[PDB]
Design a protein around this nucleic acid. Structure first.
Ligand SMILES: [Mg+2]
Ligand SMILES: [Mg+2]
Ligand SMILES: [Mg+2]
Ligand SMILES: [Mg+2]
Ligand SMILES: [Mg+2]
Ligand SMILES: [Mg+2]
Ligand SMILES: [Mg+2]
Ligand SMILES: [Mg+2]
Ligand SMILES: [Mg+2]
Ligand SMILES: [Mg+2]
Ligand SMILES: [Mg+2]
Ligand SMILES: [Mg+2]
Ligand SMILES: [Mg+2]
Ligand SMILES: [Mg+2]
Ligand SMILES: [Mg+2]
Ligand SMILES: [Mg+2]
Ligand SMILES: [Mg+2]
Ligand SMILES: [Mg+2]
Ligand SMILES: [Mg+2]
Ligand SMILES: [Mg+2]
Ligand SMILES: [Mg+2]
Ligand SMILES: [Mg+2]
Ligand SMILES: [Mg+2]
Lengths: 154, 70, 117
RNA sequence: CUUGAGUCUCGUAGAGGGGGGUAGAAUUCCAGGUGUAGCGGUGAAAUGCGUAGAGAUCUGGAGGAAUACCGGUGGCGAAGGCGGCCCCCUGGACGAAGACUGACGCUCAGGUGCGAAAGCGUGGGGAGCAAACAGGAUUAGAUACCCUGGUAGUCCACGCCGUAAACGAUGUCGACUUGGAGGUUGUGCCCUUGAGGCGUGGCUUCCGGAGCUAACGCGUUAAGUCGACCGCCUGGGGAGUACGGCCGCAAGGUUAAAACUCAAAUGAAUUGACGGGGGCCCGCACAAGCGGUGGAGCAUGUGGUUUAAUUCGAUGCAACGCGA
């Protein structure tokens, strides 16, 4: 907005693991205000992922996030009448949010049957670093590299 | 704008001196002005405008800006 | 194959392009590089970053000659004019002298006509 | 007769004019060295140039044009105009003290001369730039703007032309009328005690009083108060055109109408609105996001077509599940 530095809104942590990040993921996943359903799906996915990959639900989830967060995105600065795609360093809250968003979209795309199954598969893929959300991040980075000449001349 | 880096002079410092020397010389300005042919009339007109604006601004600041702004 | 230790870096920095040319102190060129050959075209090759990577490329090219000291002669009005020298220093030469050799006439030949844009 | 006008003496500053030398920087080209795939250009490209070795870089050479910094609302000139340094020829302005002539003055129709740039003739010269022209883009088109080239011309000699927003849009000469701040160039005194204090001339920039003006503004360099002489105007268009004359190699210049036609055309300022003006600011205006519509079936309203009738109204946002 023009004249607003509004206060960030309060998100409660999810009951199973007490995690704010996990709560945010659930919110992003949710559709039509159906939170209960979203949390069930997220928990199912986490449980399967933990069983498949290892340590905990939260550690596995974190690993996936680490492989899908973007360091740099691009904006379109339009000053000389034409638009320069400029790179820009993506701040941490955005990095988590964007990564989560990408993961959920990839999961939605994916061909497995249950949503939980798709989510688990996608997360595992992210952890390995051979999935589609990861591909998306790679594409974003590639664009930033291409437009690196317009990095610190905005 | 010749510069020679003295003994124990940092590189950044050397760069700073070089830039300052160039600015003082006025090389970039000269090149930019000599990029295209300014007509003599254009040069005269620009000079006149610069003189008028400078004089007017100075008068306004010193004499006109001697009042209570608030 | 030869070694010289001390070169001159001629940074021709026009508005469109940056040419870097390392030479022996006498005038004979060792290696060169441009933002164009460095992989930038148009809006991208007329930038400081392009000049920097051109400089890096030039340094790499003349690595065979083992050049340690280097004096830089900057020419023209350019987006680099600084990036190139910074890059060269980073690439790791001792910058000894930095000289501007932009050719100003003493009211000589007529320039081309003014662009109407 | 000496107060206007001029002469002589001594200095002063000046891109004033004419002629002839010369210097350095830079562009172009040529030859050679080094060296390798790009250069150039643009909003982005392409034409163009480059592996037949370009661009870059160093050396040498050729040649033409123009004189960075100094450089200034600085200076000089009647105006046009004049810009590196040196010499030769040469015009004017200004100050100082005197001396001299003794109204010799001001203006000027015809006339005469000078008169940017472009243009013309003849002979040179030709680097850069660049009408015309060519190709590439852009575009609906693009006989333009932009890009790459490029010939007259720009330069020199000597002739012509004779015009410009040739403008201060302000004819020349003279006198008189409150001020302030500068620039430049003389000169008198003050110890120049220092770059400095007080005068007195010339040219010059800005601001401003009275007065003037339609207003804008001008304001001791008047657009104020006056005197002499000249030039010019009499509604917009037709028209600075036609015809005639004169001048010109030509392009054209100069002098300069009439019919016909309209009731306006203009100047300055005011209030709005508008601007691909400028500054500041807001709004789900964009941005960041989430979900739709536009595809499908159906509901409903509208346009249309059909009908005997398809009642009438709403119909850019701000009509179209609206009156209903
Ligand atoms: Mg050009
Ligand atoms: Mg003189
Ligand atoms: Mg004079
Ligand atoms: Mg006459
Ligand atoms: Mg001429
Ligand atoms: Mg001729
Ligand atoms: Mg000829
Ligand atoms: Mg040309
Ligand atoms: Mg052209
Ligand atoms: Mg006339
Ligand atoms: Mg004039
Ligand atoms: Mg007139
Ligand atoms: Mg007269
Ligand atoms: Mg005034
Ligand atoms: Mg009439
Ligand atoms: Mg006529
Ligand atoms: Mg006639
Ligand atoms: Mg949006
Ligand atoms: Mg539909
Ligand atoms: Mg339809
Ligand atoms: Mg409708
Ligand atoms: Mg109806
Ligand atoms: Mg109706």
């Amino acid at each position: 907005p023009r004249r607003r530095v509004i206060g960030q809104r309060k998100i409660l942590p999810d009951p199973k693991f007490g995690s704010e990040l996990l709560a945010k993921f659930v919110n992003i996943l949710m559709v039509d205000g159906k939170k209960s359903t979203a949390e069930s799906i997220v928990y199912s996915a986490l449980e399967t992922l933990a069983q498949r990959s290892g340590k905990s639900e939260l550690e596995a989830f974190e690993v996936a996030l680490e492989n899908v967060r973007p360091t740099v995105e691009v904006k379109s600065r339009r000053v000389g009448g034409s638009t320069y795609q400029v790179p820009v360093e993506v701040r941490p809250v955005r990095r988590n949010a964007l990564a989560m968003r990408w993961i959920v979209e990839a999961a939605r795309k994916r061909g497995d049957k249950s949503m939980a199954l798709r989510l688990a598969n996608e997360l595992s893929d992210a952890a390995e670093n051979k999935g589609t959300a990861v591909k998306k991040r790679e594409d974003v980075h590639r664009m930033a590299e291409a437009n690196k000449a317009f990095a610190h001349y905005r | 704008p010749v510069i020679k880096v003295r003994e124990n002079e940092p590189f950044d410092v050397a760069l700073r001196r070089f830039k300052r020397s160039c600015e003082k010389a006025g090389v970039l300005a000269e090149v930019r002005r000599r990029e295209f042919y300014e007509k003599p009339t254009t040069e005269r007109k620009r000079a006149k405008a610069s003189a008028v604006k400078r004089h007017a601004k100075k008068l306004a600041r010193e004499n006109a800006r001697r009042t209570r702004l608030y | 194959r030869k070694q010289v230790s001390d070169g001159v870096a001629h940074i021709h920095a026009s508005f469109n392009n940056t040419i870097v040319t390392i030479t022996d102190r006498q005038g004979n060129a060792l290696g060169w590089a441009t933002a164009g050959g460095s992989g930038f075209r148009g809006s991208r090759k007329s930038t400081p970053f392009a000049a920097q990577v051109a400089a890096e490329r030039c340094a790499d090219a003349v690595k065979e000659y083992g050049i340690k000291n280097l004096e830089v002669m900057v020419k023209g009005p350019g987006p680099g004019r600084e990036s190139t020298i910074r890059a060269l220093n980073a690439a790791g030469f001792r910058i000894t002298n930095i000289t501007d050799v932009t050719p100003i006439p003493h009211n000589g030949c007529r320039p081309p006509k003014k662009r109407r844009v």
